[PDB]
Amino acid sequence: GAMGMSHIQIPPGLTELLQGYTVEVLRQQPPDLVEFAVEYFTRLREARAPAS
Amino acid sequence: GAMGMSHIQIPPGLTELLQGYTVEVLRQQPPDLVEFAVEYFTRLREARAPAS
């Protein structure tokens, strides 16, 4: 972020999760980040689609 | 050994394009991480065209 938090940075949760998952793409499958992510997140939706 | 250093080469543009999509989808007001992430990386995928 920028020094002096007057210039607000918006981290609505997805941002930190996104970073974690972007590390997942980078660490697990460096050449193709997206194919891994797509499979991982489709698997995510598959395994856990929000049920209330 | 002589080689073996994990030289994680991340292709630039991954971030840039999924950034365009992140800001756009955030503007779309995404529901949950599952659908958010699926479409997000899917948008890169849609732009790259895995099928033709």
Binding site: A2, L18, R27 | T22
Partner: peptide, 28 residues
Amino acid sequence: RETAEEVSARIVQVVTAEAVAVLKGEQE
């Protein structure tokens, strides 16, 4: 004053760059 566009860009940028730095163990 800051925008989603630029922060989101920063966030994805720093994670890829820094996680790349993690490959060497920059995190120490």
